[PDB]
Write a structure and sequence with these properties.
The structure is cut from a larger assembly and holds two copies of chain A. By secondary structure, the first copy, chain A, is mainly alpha-helical. Chain A is built from six helices and three strands; from the N terminus they run ααβαααββα. The complex binds cholesterol (2 copies). One cholesterol binds next to α1, α2 and α4 of chain A. The PDB classes it as membrane protein.
């Protein structure tokens, strides 16, 4: 777990990444993973089991939970991290492949593919930010929700588990994601400026 | 239980009552009592115990039953019979009192008090008919009712016991009451005509 080994691993052995991309982006990425790990099973572990509705209708609990939580926040963030990390993984594999072929026997190609990688990383961050806004308007969760989907008769009151703690972690993850967007834009601008 | 004894009892030993008042009104009165007796404990016995609402809210069953049944049909008819029978009871007691005092020792007074008795009997019938319409619009009861009174959350579905059988007896009692109103009006008109 040598510091130089961890730095080499996270940097992806890329010769075009700048200081922000090799230090700040990696740290924020680690921060999001650690927050997600400590908050996934602990806070969102009983999201559905503890979800109850004030009714005697069989199946109203499950249908109301599905109505109000089409996809859990933890899974949404997990997908966001995987999708955001994919272009970095592709660049790392491409660099390793180039090292392999040159050992068996370019700089502009590496520069261009890195820039495209950062652009796609920024694009994925923006898309997931918009999707999160679309599914869950606002940032705070409420204790009581009004559910009227079939088979629930009329409108029933359903209660969410730990809405305040989930709100706190939602703010943390959203703030970290916003910082990643800002750093990615700065990285793109810095690369373009240095290219001239 | 001699027929002449029952006839003397029901007639009230009144010398001004006509054939309709001494035969038809008494028979319909007996009919209402018999219908009420067979339908009071059997049909309306479990009106509240069998009344259930699709909710987990404690106390919603009792509050919803009170909201939709301010007073049961059986008790409403029981009060109607007592109130309708009161002027007949007063006349019978007054006749007995006059017999008592004359034995110890008028016809116009008996005629007038009988006419007033029939008028009040008609008035009570009309008032209870209007009250029944006011509390229970229409004649048929429904299986499912929508209740939203506190503490029930939002609107809950509550289910009535034997709404069809109660509807049948409601029609019977209402029809008998309407016949009593018609006979009372006929009695008043006949007495006035014979008075001239
Ligand atoms: C600058 C930032 C974005 C760098 C992010 C680096 C991420 C994308 C890279 C760094 C090291 C990578 C890990 C290296 C090895 C493995 C083992 C494999 O069997 C599963 C994937 C896994 C666990 C990789 C997941 C992606 C990973 C964590
Ligand atoms: C022509 C129609 C309206 C006549 C109706 C007669 C009714 C009003 C009269 C006839 C005989 C009466 C009953 C005679 C005796 C008693 C015993 C008493 O301890 C309670 C009331 C009770 C049970 C009376 C109730 C009223 C009664 C039923």
């Amino acid at each position: 777990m040598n510091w130089t080994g961890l730095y080499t691993l996270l940097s992806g052995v890329n010769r075009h990444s700048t200081a922000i991309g090799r230090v700040w982006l990696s740290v924020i990425f680690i921060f999001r993973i650690m927050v997600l790990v400590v908050a996934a099973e602990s806070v969102w572990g009983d999201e559905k089991s503890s979800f109850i509705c004030n009714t005697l209708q069989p199946g109203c609990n499950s249908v109301c939970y599905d109505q109000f939580f089409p996809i859990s926040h933890v899974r949404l963030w997990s997908l966001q991290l995987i999708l955001v990390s994919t272009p970095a993984l592709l660049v790392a594999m491409h660099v390793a492949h180039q090292q392999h072929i040159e050992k068996k026997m370019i700089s502009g190609t590496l520069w261009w593919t890195y820039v495209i990688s950062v652009v796609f990383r920024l694009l994925f961050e923006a898309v997931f930010m918009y999707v999160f806004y679309l599914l869950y308007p606002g940032y705070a969760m409420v204790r009581l929700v009004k559910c009227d989907v079939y088979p629930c008769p009329n409108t029933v009151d359903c209660f969410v588990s730990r809405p305040t703690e989930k709100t706190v972690f939602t703010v943390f993850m959203l703030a970290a994601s916003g910082i990643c967007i800002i750093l990615n834009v700065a990285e793109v601008v810095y690369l373009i400026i240095r290219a001239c």
